[PDB]
Structures are given as structure tokens and as C-alpha cells.
């Protein structure tokens, strides 16, 4: 023998806690929480800003918010299946 394995300083639970913190910050405040204090903002305006970022005006979201929410939800749901189903 003569060998050892040392435990990680941060457990899996604290790593998932940081992941939860980042997800909550992103959902509630967009990018504003990475430049300093978190500024709350409703999610559709956050997505409208992220549409201005790519050169699409805000109205394109507000007039398709139902389609965008459905597509995003379907894509997230399919990610779980694409992950479990593929073994490699």
C-alpha cells in the first residue's frame, strides 16, 4: 500500500452551493451582479437586453415571449435526455 487520497477542500455540497448561488444571481439580476452589487430585474427585460446584445431589438422578444419561453423550456428538457441517453 503506502498510498493516500486526500479529500477535496470544498465538498460536492459546497460546490453545488456555489453553482446555486451563480444561477440565482444570473436569473434574478443578469450580469449586474458580477460588476458589483446585484440589481434585480424581471427576466423578460434581462432577455431583451441579451437580445440587444446580439443586434435584435427588444420588440422581437416581447412579441414572441411565449414562443421563446416554450423553446427554452423544451431545450432545457431535451438536454437532460440528450445527457442520460448518450453514454459517452
Amino acid at each position: 500500500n503506502g498510498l493516500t487520497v486526500l479529500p477535496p477542500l470544498l465538498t460536492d455540497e459546497m460546490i453545488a452551493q456555489y453553482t446555486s448561488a451563480l444561477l440565482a444571481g444570473t436569473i434574478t439580476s443578469g450580469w449586474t451582479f458580477g460588476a458589483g452589487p446585484a440589481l434585480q430585474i424581471p427576466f423578460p427585460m434581462q432577455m431583451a437586453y441579451r437580445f440587444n446584445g446580439i443586434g435584435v431589438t427588444q420588440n422581437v422578444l416581447y412579441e414572441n415571449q411565449k414562443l421563446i419561453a416554450n423553446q427554452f423550456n423544451s431545450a432545457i428538457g431535451k438536454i437532460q435526455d440528450s445527457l442520460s441517453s448518450t453514454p459517452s
Binding site: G36, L39, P44, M45, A48, Q58, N59
Partner: protein, 105 residues
């Protein structure tokens, strides 16, 4: 380039190394508000051009998303696209116009 919005940085030397002085813009003194995706004037929805609609609780204002500079809604702080039915969360308010006053003076 540092934490915060990056303005600019200044290099420095060090023994077997370099040092960067990162000058960044950090917001502070945040203030709560109420917002609307769009503001309906006469059945046409007006969206902000480069800012966000906010309300002091009495009147509606447009302001740049990173700094509170309340300005009065006009036909130059907004653009018109679509009718008020499709948008969700739209609020009713008045859109000022510069042309009609001087046209009527």
C-alpha cells in the same frame, strides 16, 4: 480586466513580473423602481431606444440602464412597433411629442 466595468489599466514593472493597475467602474447607491416592457399611448406600443422605462410611482421616465438619469418619454427616446395587445406587462402612459407644440405655435 479587474472586477467591475473596465475603464482602463496602467502597467507597472516588478522583479521578474508585471503588475496591472485596473481602473474599473463599480455602480453603487441603487434605487428601487417599477418598470414596463413597453408603454402604450394610443394603441401603439413604444419601446425604449437605449434605456429602460421606470416609474417614480407617479410618472413614467426613461433612463440609461446603468445610471439613473430620468428623462421624459418622447418620440425620440422610444420607437413604435406593434399594438398593445401582444405585449405582456405593457402599461398605459402618455408619449410626449416635440413637433406638435412648435407646429401649434
Amino acid at each position: 480586466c479587474g472586477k467591475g466595468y473596465h475603464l482602463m489599466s496602467f502597467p507597472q514593472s516588478a522583479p521578474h513580473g508585471v503588475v496591472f493597475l485596473h481602473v474599473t467602474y463599480v455602480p453603487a447607491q441603487e434605487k428601487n423602481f417599477t418598470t414596463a416592457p413597453a408603454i402604450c399611448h394610443d394603441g401603439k406600443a413604444h419601446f425604449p431606444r437605449e434605456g429602460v422605462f421606470v416609474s417614480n410611482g407617479t410618472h413614467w421616465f426613461v433612463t440609461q440602464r446603468n445610471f439613473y438619469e430620468p428623462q421624459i418619454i418622447t418620440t425620440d427616446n422610444t420607437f413604435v412597433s406593434g399594438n398593445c395587445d401582444v405585449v405582456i406587462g405593457i402599461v398605459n402612459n402618455t408619449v410626449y411629442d416635440p413637433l406638435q407644440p412648435e407646429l401649434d405655435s
